[PDB]
Design a protein around this ligand. Structure first.
Ligand SMILES: NC(=O)[C@H]1CCCN(C(=O)Cc2cccc3c2CCC3)C1
Ligand SMILES: [Zn+2]
Length: 139
C-alpha cells in the first residue's frame, strides 16, 4: 500500500484505488496501473522532473529503504494476476531488488523528488510506475 500527495492530487496504484478515489477521479490509466484522485487538503510531496536512473525505494515487506539502479520508462510484459489479464504495462521501470505483492505503493525517490511508485515484481525484480512525465500534477 501507499500513495503520492502533491497539491490537490493523490496518486495511487489503479488496482488498489478505493471507492473514494473512483468517486473523485481526475485521470486513470489501466495500461500504467495509475489512478489520480482529487483531495481536499494540499499535499506536500515534490515530483522529480529529470531522467535519473538511480534512486532509493521503500520496501514494506522488509521495513527498509534500498538504493537501486533502474531502467527508463518502457513497455514491459506483466504476467497475469487477480487484477489484470496478462498484458504490456507502459511507463514501467525495472530494478533488481526484493518485492512482494503488498509492496505496491512504496515510493521511489531520487535527489530531485518522487520518481514513481512500486507496481510490479517477482523473481528478484521490482517494477515502478513512473510519474515524472505527468507535468499537470504541479499546476
Ligand atoms: N501492475 C500489475 O499488473 C500488478 C497488479 C497487482 C498484482 N501484481 C503483482 O502482485 C506482481 C508482483 C509479484 C511479486 C512481487 C511484487 C509484485 C507487485 C509488487 C511487488 C502486478
Ligand atoms: Zn532525479
Amino acid at each position: 500500500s501507499g500513495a503520492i500527495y502533491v497539491g490537490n492530487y493523490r496518486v495511487v496504484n489503479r488496482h488498489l484505488a478505493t471507492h473514494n478515489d473512483w468517486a473523485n477521479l481526475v485521470w486513470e490509466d489501466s495500461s500504467r496501473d495509475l489512478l489520480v484522485s482529487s483531495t481536499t487538503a494540499q499535499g506536500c510531496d515534490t515530483i522529480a522532473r529529470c531522467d535519473c536512473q538511480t534512486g532509493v525505494y521503500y520496501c514494506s515487506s522488509r521495513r527498509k529503504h534500498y538504493p537501486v539502479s533502474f531502467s527508463k520508462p518502457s513497455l514491459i510484459f506483466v504476467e497475469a494476476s487477480e487484477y489484470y489479464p496478462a498484458r504490456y504495462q507502459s511507463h514501467l521501470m525495472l530494478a533488481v531488488g526484493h518485492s512482494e505483492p503488498g509492496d505496491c505503493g512504496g515510493i521511489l525517490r531520487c535527489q530531485h523528488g518522487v520518481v514513481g511508485i512500486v507496481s510490479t515484481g517477482g523473481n528478484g525484480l521490482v517494477g515502478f510506475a513512473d510519474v515524472r512525465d505527468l507535468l499537470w500534477l504541479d499546476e
